[PDB]
Amino acid sequence: PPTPHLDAIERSLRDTSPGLEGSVWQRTDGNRLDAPDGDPAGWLLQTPGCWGDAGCKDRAGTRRLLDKMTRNIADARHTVDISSLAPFPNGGFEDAVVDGLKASVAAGHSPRVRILVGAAPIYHLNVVPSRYRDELIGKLGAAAGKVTLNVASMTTSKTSLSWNHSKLLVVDGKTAITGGINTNKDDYLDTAHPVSDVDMALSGPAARSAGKYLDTLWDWTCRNASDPAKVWLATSNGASCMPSMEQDEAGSAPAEPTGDVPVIAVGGLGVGIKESDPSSGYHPDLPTAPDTKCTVGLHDNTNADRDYDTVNPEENALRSLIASARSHVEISQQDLNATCPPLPRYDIRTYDTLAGKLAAGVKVRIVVSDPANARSQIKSLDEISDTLRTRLVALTGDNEKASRALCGNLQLASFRSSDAAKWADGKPYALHHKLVSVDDSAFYIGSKNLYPAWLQDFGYIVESPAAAQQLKTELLDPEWKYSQQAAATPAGCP
């Protein structure tokens, strides 16, 4: 069974970060999209999952999500490995963690647990690691004696604004849930305007790849606990820091297949963990589009730093995923552009790839979060279409061609999940997908936004016509059904 899209992505990863294979990216065969029997699309964990109701009254997505989390953890035999943006899991997210661990202990096991969160310097931490550890210990009751906690918040670079942003749940390095959903009850659960987001659940060797990525973050995190400005750390039962929990779990036996789904796991180290992959002969011709509505404040890692690329292969991975499209791409994101200063307004290579797809007659759909959330960094959808026009002209020298491609081949809109322009409680819909789909064959689900950001992130790229058909039916077709009523008409179009 052929995988032209993964092939193209793996080529780009081998060119960019050969030395990070086996830790920050890895391609595997034999995975299973982990769907509960009776619900074959249930591996797709969207939230809230209330299409067609501005009252978001029947939240099938959230239900399925929290119960997959609980069950995955309830089945832990050795290791539970959680990462997220701060705060530490709370509300129903925490109940999943505690019920799962208690059930694991009840089954006779002694789980080792790492919970890791990134924290922006701006962010003042309500529940600090030691406070959060004590709360878990209290809720674990008599099970706490059987649970080895590691709990940490981290910031790898204040000046370059790098901290963990990956959203991972890895159990026994065998099951893994990942996507854009942070363990924050207020965004997703206790609200009449839930954030729309998506995770995916799988089992098999790609889960171990996610474990190896987390080992890479905890190796840095454990050592840098000597600097409390960067890492705050709390453990239970007098336990040491556990930097290689997943490698110990894996031992030396290779990972065993659970299905037939090929997957690339791909992450990034952000800034302040590893300067470069010295293995790499990556020598890019980088593009210099002078953005004159904000001459970048900080050093531009997204567009003008070869070294950054070598320790963040996810950037090129997403670029080549898009570039491997031969028929159509759907992009569902919070945003394509970042706030400048201090970050660059956009990723030039990403926009050049999209522009190239338009010029080639490839269909491009971009659905982003409503600008009224500004949970949105553009003042207008036309900032996206104008940038695509600028790059189109830069690459073809043909503004007439640019208008045909842009008016004929571009679908650009703000996100909606019902016929109403906003949630029934008056707040606009907020979109937090980090999703890219190509040719109804391969798709990215993970934490890496397409807009410029220099964080640790992680995600999976699946190539499966059956799975992508499910993604289309359960998410992309519904998204367009309601979002096209908020479509932009770009300047220069009828």
Short mmCIF file of all heavy atoms in Angstrom, two decimals, residues 264-327:
data_model
loop_
_atom_site.label_atom_id
_atom_site.label_comp_id
_atom_site.label_asym_id
_atom_site.label_seq_id
_atom_site.Cartn_x
_atom_site.Cartn_y
_atom_site.Cartn_z
N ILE A 264 4.01 8.96 10.69
CA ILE A 264 5.20 9.71 11.06
C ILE A 264 4.88 10.49 12.32
O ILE A 264 3.94 11.29 12.35
CB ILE A 264 5.64 10.67 9.94
CG1 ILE A 264 6.25 9.89 8.78
CG2 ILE A 264 6.60 11.68 10.51
CD1 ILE A 264 6.21 10.67 7.49
N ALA A 265 5.67 10.26 13.36
CA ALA A 265 5.65 11.11 14.54
C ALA A 265 6.73 12.16 14.38
O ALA A 265 7.86 11.84 14.01
CB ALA A 265 5.90 10.29 15.81
N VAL A 266 6.39 13.42 14.64
CA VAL A 266 7.32 14.52 14.40
C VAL A 266 7.07 15.61 15.42
O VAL A 266 5.92 15.99 15.66
CB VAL A 266 7.21 15.06 12.96
CG1 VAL A 266 5.81 15.67 12.70
CG2 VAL A 266 8.34 16.07 12.67
N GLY A 267 8.15 16.08 16.05
CA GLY A 267 8.09 17.12 17.06
C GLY A 267 9.08 18.24 16.78
O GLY A 267 9.65 18.35 15.69
N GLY A 268 9.28 19.08 17.77
CA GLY A 268 10.29 20.12 17.69
C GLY A 268 10.75 20.49 19.08
O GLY A 268 10.00 20.35 20.05
N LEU A 269 12.00 20.95 19.17
CA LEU A 269 12.65 21.27 20.43
C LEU A 269 12.57 22.75 20.77
O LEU A 269 13.11 23.17 21.80
CB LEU A 269 14.11 20.82 20.41
CG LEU A 269 14.33 19.32 20.34
CD1 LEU A 269 15.78 18.94 20.66
CD2 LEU A 269 13.37 18.63 21.28
N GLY A 270 11.91 23.53 19.93
CA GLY A 270 11.79 24.95 20.22
C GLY A 270 13.17 25.59 20.28
O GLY A 270 14.03 25.33 19.43
N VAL A 271 13.38 26.41 21.30
CA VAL A 271 14.61 27.16 21.49
C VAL A 271 15.07 26.94 22.92
O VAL A 271 14.26 27.02 23.86
CB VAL A 271 14.41 28.67 21.23
CG1 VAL A 271 15.68 29.46 21.60
CG2 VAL A 271 14.02 28.90 19.76
N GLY A 272 16.36 26.65 23.09
CA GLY A 272 16.95 26.58 24.42
C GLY A 272 17.15 25.19 24.97
O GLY A 272 17.54 25.06 26.15
N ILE A 273 16.87 24.16 24.20
CA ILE A 273 17.20 22.79 24.57
C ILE A 273 18.40 22.30 23.79
O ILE A 273 19.33 21.71 24.35
CB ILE A 273 15.99 21.85 24.34
CG1 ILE A 273 14.82 22.23 25.24
CG2 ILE A 273 16.41 20.39 24.54
CD1 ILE A 273 13.51 21.50 24.87
N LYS A 274 18.40 22.51 22.48
CA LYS A 274 19.45 22.00 21.61
C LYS A 274 19.67 23.02 20.51
O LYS A 274 18.71 23.44 19.86
CB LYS A 274 19.06 20.63 21.03
CG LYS A 274 20.25 19.79 20.60
CD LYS A 274 19.83 18.38 20.19
CE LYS A 274 21.03 17.45 20.31
NZ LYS A 274 20.90 16.20 19.51
N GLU A 275 20.92 23.42 20.33
CA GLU A 275 21.21 24.50 19.41
C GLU A 275 21.05 24.05 17.96
O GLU A 275 20.48 24.79 17.15
CB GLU A 275 22.62 25.02 19.64
CG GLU A 275 23.01 26.09 18.63
CD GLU A 275 24.33 26.75 18.95
OE1 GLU A 275 25.38 26.06 18.97
OE2 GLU A 275 24.31 27.98 19.18
N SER A 276 21.54 22.87 17.63
CA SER A 276 21.48 22.41 16.25
C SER A 276 21.58 20.89 16.23
O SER A 276 21.99 20.27 17.21
CB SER A 276 22.60 23.04 15.40
OG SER A 276 23.72 22.19 15.34
N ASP A 277 21.17 20.31 15.11
CA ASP A 277 21.52 18.91 14.86
C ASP A 277 22.84 18.91 14.07
O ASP A 277 22.83 19.08 12.84
CB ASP A 277 20.39 18.20 14.12
CG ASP A 277 20.83 16.89 13.49
OD1 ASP A 277 21.82 16.31 13.96
OD2 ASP A 277 20.18 16.45 12.50
N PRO A 278 23.99 18.72 14.74
CA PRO A 278 25.27 18.79 14.01
C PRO A 278 25.45 17.68 13.00
O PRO A 278 26.39 17.74 12.20
CB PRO A 278 26.32 18.69 15.12
CG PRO A 278 25.61 17.98 16.24
CD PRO A 278 24.14 18.28 16.13
N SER A 279 24.59 16.66 13.05
CA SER A 279 24.52 15.64 12.01
C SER A 279 24.13 16.23 10.66
O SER A 279 24.46 15.65 9.61
CB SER A 279 23.47 14.60 12.44
OG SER A 279 23.71 13.32 11.92
N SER A 280 23.42 17.34 10.65
CA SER A 280 22.60 17.69 9.50
C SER A 280 23.38 18.52 8.48
O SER A 280 24.05 19.49 8.84
CB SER A 280 21.36 18.46 9.95
OG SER A 280 20.71 19.07 8.84
N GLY A 281 23.25 18.16 7.21
CA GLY A 281 23.80 18.93 6.11
C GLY A 281 22.78 19.88 5.51
O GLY A 281 22.94 20.32 4.37
N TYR A 282 21.73 20.18 6.27
CA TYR A 282 20.65 21.05 5.82
C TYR A 282 21.18 22.44 5.49
O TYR A 282 21.64 23.17 6.38
CB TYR A 282 19.57 21.12 6.91
CG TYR A 282 18.32 21.93 6.55
CD1 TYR A 282 17.54 21.61 5.43
CD2 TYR A 282 17.92 22.99 7.35
CE1 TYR A 282 16.40 22.36 5.12
CE2 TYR A 282 16.78 23.74 7.04
CZ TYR A 282 16.03 23.42 5.94
OH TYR A 282 14.92 24.18 5.68
N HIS A 283 21.11 22.83 4.22
CA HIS A 283 21.65 24.12 3.77
C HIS A 283 20.60 24.83 2.93
O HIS A 283 20.65 24.82 1.70
CB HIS A 283 22.96 23.92 2.99
CG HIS A 283 24.13 23.56 3.85
ND1 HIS A 283 24.30 24.05 5.13
CD2 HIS A 283 25.18 22.73 3.62
CE1 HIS A 283 25.41 23.55 5.65
NE2 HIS A 283 25.97 22.75 4.75
N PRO A 284 19.64 25.49 3.58
CA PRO A 284 18.53 26.10 2.84
C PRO A 284 18.87 27.44 2.21
O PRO A 284 19.62 28.25 2.76
CB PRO A 284 17.45 26.28 3.93
CG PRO A 284 18.24 26.46 5.21
CD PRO A 284 19.43 25.53 5.04
N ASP A 285 18.28 27.66 1.03
CA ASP A 285 18.14 28.99 0.44
C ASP A 285 16.95 29.65 1.12
O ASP A 285 15.80 29.37 0.78
CB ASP A 285 17.91 28.88 -1.06
CG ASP A 285 19.07 29.43 -1.87
OD1 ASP A 285 20.09 29.85 -1.28
OD2 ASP A 285 18.96 29.44 -3.12
N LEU A 286 17.22 30.55 2.11
CA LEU A 286 15.96 30.93 2.75
C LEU A 286 15.35 32.16 2.07
O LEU A 286 16.06 32.97 1.48
CB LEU A 286 16.18 31.22 4.23
CG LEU A 286 16.70 29.97 4.93
CD1 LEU A 286 17.18 30.27 6.33
CD2 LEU A 286 15.62 28.88 4.95
N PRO A 287 14.02 32.30 2.15
CA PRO A 287 13.37 33.42 1.46
C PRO A 287 13.38 34.66 2.34
O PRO A 287 13.31 34.57 3.57
CB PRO A 287 11.94 32.91 1.26
CG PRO A 287 11.71 32.09 2.52
CD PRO A 287 13.06 31.52 2.94
N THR A 288 13.51 35.82 1.70
CA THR A 288 13.53 37.10 2.40
C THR A 288 12.46 37.99 1.78
O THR A 288 12.74 38.87 0.96
CB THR A 288 14.92 37.79 2.36
OG1 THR A 288 15.95 36.80 2.44
CG2 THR A 288 15.05 38.77 3.53
N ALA A 289 11.22 37.73 2.18
CA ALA A 289 10.10 38.63 1.93
C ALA A 289 10.13 39.74 2.97
O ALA A 289 9.81 39.49 4.14
CB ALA A 289 8.78 37.88 2.00
N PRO A 290 10.49 40.96 2.60
CA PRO A 290 10.53 42.04 3.60
C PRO A 290 9.14 42.43 4.05
O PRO A 290 8.43 43.14 3.33
CB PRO A 290 11.24 43.18 2.86
CG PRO A 290 10.93 42.93 1.42
CD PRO A 290 10.86 41.43 1.25
N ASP A 291 8.72 41.95 5.21
CA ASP A 291 7.44 42.33 5.79
C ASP A 291 7.58 43.73 6.38
O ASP A 291 8.29 43.92 7.38
CB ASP A 291 7.00 41.32 6.84
CG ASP A 291 5.57 41.52 7.27
OD1 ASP A 291 4.67 41.35 6.42
OD2 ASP A 291 5.33 41.86 8.45
N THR A 292 6.91 44.72 5.77
CA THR A 292 7.07 46.12 6.14
C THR A 292 5.87 46.68 6.91
O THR A 292 5.78 47.90 7.11
CB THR A 292 7.34 46.98 4.89
OG1 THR A 292 8.46 46.44 4.17
CG2 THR A 292 7.66 48.43 5.26
N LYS A 293 4.95 45.82 7.36
CA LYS A 293 3.97 46.18 8.37
C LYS A 293 4.37 45.68 9.76
O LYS A 293 3.54 45.63 10.67
CB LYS A 293 2.58 45.67 7.98
CG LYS A 293 2.21 46.00 6.54
CD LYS A 293 2.09 47.51 6.32
CE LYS A 293 1.09 47.81 5.22
NZ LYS A 293 0.81 46.58 4.42
N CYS A 294 5.64 45.29 9.92
CA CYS A 294 6.28 44.97 11.19
C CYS A 294 7.64 44.33 10.94
O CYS A 294 7.75 43.10 10.85
CB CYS A 294 5.44 44.02 12.04
SG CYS A 294 6.31 43.48 13.56
N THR A 295 8.69 45.15 10.80
CA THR A 295 10.03 44.59 10.65
C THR A 295 10.38 43.88 11.95
O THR A 295 10.76 44.52 12.94
CB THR A 295 11.04 45.67 10.30
OG1 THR A 295 10.44 46.62 9.41
CG2 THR A 295 12.26 45.05 9.61
N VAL A 296 10.22 42.56 11.93
CA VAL A 296 10.46 41.64 13.05
C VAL A 296 11.24 42.28 14.19
O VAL A 296 12.32 42.86 13.97
CB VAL A 296 11.17 40.37 12.54
CG1 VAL A 296 10.32 39.66 11.48
CG2 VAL A 296 12.56 40.71 12.00
N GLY A 297 10.70 42.19 15.40
CA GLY A 297 11.45 42.52 16.60
C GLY A 297 12.59 41.55 16.84
O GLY A 297 13.75 41.88 16.56
N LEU A 298 12.28 40.35 17.32
CA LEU A 298 13.32 39.38 17.66
C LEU A 298 13.93 38.74 16.40
O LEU A 298 13.42 38.86 15.29
CB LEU A 298 12.76 38.28 18.57
CG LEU A 298 11.99 38.60 19.85
CD1 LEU A 298 11.36 37.32 20.40
CD2 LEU A 298 12.89 39.24 20.92
N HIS A 299 15.07 38.08 16.62
CA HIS A 299 15.67 37.21 15.61
C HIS A 299 14.64 36.22 15.06
O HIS A 299 13.95 35.54 15.82
CB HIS A 299 16.85 36.48 16.25
CG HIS A 299 17.48 35.44 15.37
ND1 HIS A 299 18.19 35.77 14.24
CD2 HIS A 299 17.48 34.09 15.45
CE1 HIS A 299 18.61 34.66 13.66
NE2 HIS A 299 18.19 33.63 14.37
N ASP A 300 14.53 36.13 13.73
CA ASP A 300 13.43 35.39 13.10
C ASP A 300 13.84 33.93 12.91
O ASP A 300 14.42 33.55 11.89
CB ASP A 300 13.02 36.04 11.80
CG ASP A 300 11.77 35.39 11.18
OD1 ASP A 300 11.46 34.22 11.52
OD2 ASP A 300 11.10 36.03 10.34
N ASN A 301 13.50 33.09 13.90
CA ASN A 301 13.81 31.66 13.80
C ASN A 301 12.96 30.96 12.75
O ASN A 301 13.43 30.00 12.12
CB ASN A 301 13.61 30.98 15.16
CG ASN A 301 14.58 31.49 16.20
OD1 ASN A 301 15.79 31.51 15.99
ND2 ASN A 301 14.05 31.92 17.33
N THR A 302 11.71 31.40 12.56
CA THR A 302 10.82 30.72 11.63
C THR A 302 11.34 30.82 10.20
O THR A 302 11.31 29.84 9.45
CB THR A 302 9.41 31.30 11.71
OG1 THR A 302 8.87 31.07 13.02
CG2 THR A 302 8.54 30.67 10.66
N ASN A 303 11.83 31.99 9.82
CA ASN A 303 12.18 32.26 8.43
C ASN A 303 13.67 32.43 8.18
O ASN A 303 14.10 32.31 7.03
CB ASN A 303 11.43 33.51 7.96
CG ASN A 303 9.91 33.36 8.04
OD1 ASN A 303 9.35 32.43 7.46
ND2 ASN A 303 9.25 34.26 8.77
N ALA A 304 14.48 32.68 9.21
CA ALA A 304 15.86 33.08 8.97
C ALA A 304 16.82 32.40 9.94
O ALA A 304 17.77 33.02 10.43
CB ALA A 304 16.01 34.60 9.04
N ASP A 305 16.61 31.10 10.22
CA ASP A 305 17.50 30.40 11.16
C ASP A 305 17.58 28.92 10.77
O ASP A 305 16.74 28.12 11.18
CB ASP A 305 17.05 30.56 12.60
CG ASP A 305 18.14 30.16 13.60
OD1 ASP A 305 18.52 28.97 13.66
OD2 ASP A 305 18.61 31.04 14.34
N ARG A 306 18.62 28.58 10.02
CA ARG A 306 18.84 27.21 9.60
C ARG A 306 18.92 26.25 10.79
O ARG A 306 18.38 25.13 10.73
CB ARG A 306 20.12 27.18 8.76
CG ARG A 306 20.59 25.82 8.35
CD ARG A 306 21.57 25.25 9.34
NE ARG A 306 22.02 23.96 8.84
CZ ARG A 306 22.70 23.08 9.55
NH1 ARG A 306 23.01 23.34 10.81
NH2 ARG A 306 23.06 21.94 9.00
N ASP A 307 19.62 26.65 11.86
CA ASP A 307 19.79 25.80 13.04
C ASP A 307 18.46 25.42 13.66
O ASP A 307 18.21 24.25 13.97
CB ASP A 307 20.66 26.52 14.07
CG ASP A 307 22.15 26.28 13.85
OD1 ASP A 307 22.52 25.52 12.93
OD2 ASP A 307 22.94 26.86 14.61
N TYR A 308 17.61 26.42 13.90
CA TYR A 308 16.26 26.18 14.40
C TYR A 308 15.56 25.07 13.62
O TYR A 308 14.95 24.16 14.20
CB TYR A 308 15.47 27.48 14.32
CG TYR A 308 14.05 27.34 14.79
CD1 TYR A 308 13.72 27.59 16.12
CD2 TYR A 308 13.04 26.97 13.91
CE1 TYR A 308 12.43 27.46 16.56
CE2 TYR A 308 11.74 26.84 14.35
CZ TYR A 308 11.44 27.09 15.68
OH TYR A 308 10.14 26.97 16.14
N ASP A 309 15.63 25.12 12.28
CA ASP A 309 14.97 24.10 11.47
C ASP A 309 15.43 22.70 11.86
O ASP A 309 14.61 21.77 11.98
CB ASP A 309 15.22 24.37 9.99
CG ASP A 309 14.18 25.31 9.36
OD1 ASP A 309 13.01 25.33 9.80
OD2 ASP A 309 14.54 26.04 8.41
N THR A 310 16.74 22.53 12.11
CA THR A 310 17.31 21.21 12.36
C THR A 310 16.87 20.63 13.69
O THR A 310 16.91 19.41 13.85
CB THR A 310 18.86 21.24 12.31
OG1 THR A 310 19.39 22.03 13.38
CG2 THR A 310 19.37 21.77 10.96
N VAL A 311 16.45 21.46 14.65
CA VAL A 311 15.94 20.97 15.92
C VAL A 311 14.42 21.16 16.01
O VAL A 311 13.83 20.86 17.07
CB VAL A 311 16.67 21.62 17.11
CG1 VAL A 311 18.13 21.19 17.12
CG2 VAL A 311 16.59 23.13 17.04
N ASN A 312 13.78 21.60 14.93
CA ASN A 312 12.32 21.68 14.84
C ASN A 312 11.86 21.11 13.50
O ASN A 312 11.33 21.82 12.64
CB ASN A 312 11.86 23.12 15.03
CG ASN A 312 12.14 23.64 16.43
OD1 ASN A 312 11.31 23.51 17.34
ND2 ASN A 312 13.32 24.20 16.62
N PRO A 313 12.07 19.81 13.29
CA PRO A 313 11.66 19.21 12.01
C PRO A 313 10.17 19.28 11.74
O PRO A 313 9.77 19.06 10.58
CB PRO A 313 12.15 17.75 12.12
CG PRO A 313 12.40 17.53 13.61
CD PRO A 313 12.78 18.86 14.16
N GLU A 314 9.34 19.55 12.75
CA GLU A 314 7.90 19.69 12.52
C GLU A 314 7.58 20.82 11.55
O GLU A 314 6.61 20.73 10.79
CB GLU A 314 7.16 19.91 13.84
CG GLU A 314 7.50 21.23 14.54
CD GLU A 314 7.06 21.24 16.01
OE1 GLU A 314 6.22 20.39 16.39
OE2 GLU A 314 7.57 22.08 16.79
N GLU A 315 8.38 21.90 11.55
CA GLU A 315 8.13 23.00 10.63
C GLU A 315 8.24 22.52 9.19
O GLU A 315 7.31 22.70 8.39
CB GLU A 315 9.11 24.15 10.89
CG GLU A 315 8.72 25.09 12.04
CD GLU A 315 9.19 24.54 13.37
OE1 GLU A 315 9.84 23.47 13.33
OE2 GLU A 315 8.94 25.17 14.43
N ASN A 316 9.36 21.88 8.84
CA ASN A 316 9.47 21.35 7.49
C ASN A 316 8.47 20.23 7.26
O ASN A 316 7.94 20.10 6.14
CB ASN A 316 10.90 20.90 7.19
CG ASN A 316 11.74 22.03 6.65
OD1 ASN A 316 11.23 23.13 6.40
ND2 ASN A 316 13.03 21.78 6.43
N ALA A 317 8.16 19.44 8.29
CA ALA A 317 7.21 18.34 8.08
C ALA A 317 5.86 18.87 7.61
O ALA A 317 5.26 18.35 6.66
CB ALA A 317 7.05 17.51 9.34
N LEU A 318 5.37 19.93 8.27
CA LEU A 318 4.10 20.52 7.88
C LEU A 318 4.19 21.16 6.49
O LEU A 318 3.24 21.08 5.70
CB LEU A 318 3.66 21.54 8.93
CG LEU A 318 3.12 20.95 10.23
CD1 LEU A 318 2.97 22.00 11.33
CD2 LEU A 318 1.78 20.27 9.98
N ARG A 319 5.34 21.78 6.17
CA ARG A 319 5.53 22.37 4.85
C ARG A 319 5.49 21.30 3.75
O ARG A 319 4.85 21.50 2.72
CB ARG A 319 6.85 23.15 4.78
CG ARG A 319 6.84 24.50 5.50
CD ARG A 319 8.27 24.95 5.82
NE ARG A 319 8.27 26.03 6.79
CZ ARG A 319 9.27 26.29 7.63
NH1 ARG A 319 10.36 25.54 7.63
NH2 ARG A 319 9.17 27.30 8.48
N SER A 320 6.14 20.15 3.97
CA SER A 320 6.15 19.12 2.94
C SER A 320 4.84 18.34 2.86
O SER A 320 4.47 17.84 1.79
CB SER A 320 7.31 18.14 3.15
OG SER A 320 7.56 17.96 4.51
N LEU A 321 4.14 18.21 3.99
CA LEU A 321 2.80 17.66 3.95
C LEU A 321 1.93 18.49 3.01
O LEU A 321 1.34 17.96 2.06
CB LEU A 321 2.22 17.60 5.36
CG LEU A 321 0.74 17.19 5.45
CD1 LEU A 321 0.53 15.86 4.75
CD2 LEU A 321 0.30 17.09 6.90
N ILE A 322 1.91 19.81 3.21
CA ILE A 322 1.17 20.69 2.31
C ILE A 322 1.68 20.52 0.89
O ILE A 322 0.90 20.35 -0.05
CB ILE A 322 1.28 22.16 2.76
CG1 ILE A 322 0.60 22.38 4.12
CG2 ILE A 322 0.67 23.07 1.71
CD1 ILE A 322 0.85 23.76 4.71
N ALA A 323 3.01 20.53 0.72
CA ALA A 323 3.60 20.50 -0.61
C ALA A 323 3.33 19.19 -1.33
O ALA A 323 3.32 19.16 -2.56
CB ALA A 323 5.11 20.76 -0.53
N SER A 324 3.11 18.10 -0.59
CA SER A 324 2.79 16.83 -1.23
C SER A 324 1.37 16.76 -1.77
O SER A 324 0.97 15.70 -2.25
CB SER A 324 3.00 15.66 -0.27
OG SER A 324 1.94 15.57 0.67
N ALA A 325 0.59 17.83 -1.67
CA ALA A 325 -0.79 17.78 -2.12
C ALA A 325 -0.85 17.85 -3.64
O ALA A 325 -0.23 18.72 -4.25
CB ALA A 325 -1.60 18.93 -1.52
N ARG A 326 -1.57 16.92 -4.26
CA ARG A 326 -1.71 16.94 -5.70
C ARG A 326 -3.12 17.29 -6.15
O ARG A 326 -3.32 17.60 -7.33
CB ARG A 326 -1.31 15.58 -6.29
CG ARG A 326 0.16 15.26 -6.12
CD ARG A 326 1.02 16.38 -6.72
NE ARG A 326 2.46 16.14 -6.57
CZ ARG A 326 3.29 16.92 -5.87
NH1 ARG A 326 2.83 18.02 -5.27
NH2 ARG A 326 4.57 16.62 -5.80
N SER A 327 -4.08 17.29 -5.24
CA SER A 327 -5.46 17.55 -5.63
C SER A 327 -6.10 18.62 -4.76
O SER A 327 -6.70 19.56 -5.27
CB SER A 327 -6.25 16.24 -5.58
OG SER A 327 -7.61 16.47 -5.86
#
